[PDB]
Amino acid sequence: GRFSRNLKDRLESNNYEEMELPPPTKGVIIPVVHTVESAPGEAFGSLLVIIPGAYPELLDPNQQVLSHFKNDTGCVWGIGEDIPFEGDDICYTALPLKEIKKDGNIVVEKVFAGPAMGPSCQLGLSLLVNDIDKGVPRMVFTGEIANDEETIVPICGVDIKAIAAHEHGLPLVGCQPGVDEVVANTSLASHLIQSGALPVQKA
Ligand SMILES: [Mg+2]
After folding, report:
1. N or C: which end of the chain has fewer CB within 10 A?
2. So where's the catalytic machinery, residue-wise (predicted)?
3. Was 89 annotated as part of a binding site?
4. Domains of the chain by range and CATH?
5. How far apart are CA 138 and CA 99, in angstroms?
6. Strand stretches in the chain, DSSP E
7. What is the spatial distance between Cα 122 and Cα 114, in angstroms, rounded to a whole number?
8. Distance from Cα 147 to the centre of ligand 1, integer Å
């Protein structure tokens, strides 16, 4: 689709039961694209945050769907397709992220929609089970993961996702034109997480 602020306000007006939670042990932020049948050609993005633990009861019942990592190696609630690589034996919940407060608290909310579909979450999840140990990287990841499990693969809707990242004052991270910061593989992505941001040359 293409960005609709009209679509955004209507759908989001329908979000309910927003909650301020404690900072998760760790977590990872990724973008999603909303559409509806009766708004052809319109889209808007928002953010998920994926946290350790199974909290289906925090999701709208229409997202209470459980997907697994490859070979029974963990699960994610709120995601609608299985993950084609291994997890870290944990179960996560992907929650609609309204706000990430200055004290670290996250404000989530319930969203009238289906679970997150498609492959663009992979970069985030791969980084979450492999490369993140403490905290939530203050950046937004999008990208498919290749069969080598290191090469990042271009995805769809990058303009929409950038916009949703930016609404939160966060950079979009991926492998393709449209992203604010560019990583071709999970190594560089991981070095970026350690740095907390793109390394600077204030020279
Ligand atoms: Mg294991």
Report:
1. C
2. 120 (nucleophile), 161
3. yes
4. 1-203 (3.30.230.110)
5. 12
6. 2-3, 16-21, 28-34, 42-52, 66-68, 75-77, 91-100, 106-110, 140-141, 144-145, 152-153, 172-174, 181-182
7. 18
8. 20
Show Cβ contacts of residue 89 under 8 Å, excluding neighbours closer than 6 positions.
73, 74
Write the single-letter amino acid at 8: K
Distance (Å) from CA 39 to ligand 1 centroid = 44
For the record, the structure tokens of 168 come out as 């939160």
Q: What is the 184 CA–ligand 1 centroid distance (Å)?
A: 27
Question: What CA–CA distance (Å, rounded) separates 71 from 84?
Answer: 9
Token duo for residue 146: 């290749």
Residue 49 structure tokens: 């945050």
Tokens of 144: 């498919």
Resolution in A: 2.5
What experiment produced this structure? X-ray
- Other CB atoms within 10 Å distance of the CB of residue 188: 16
**From CA 29, how far away is CA 116, in angstroms rounded?**
13
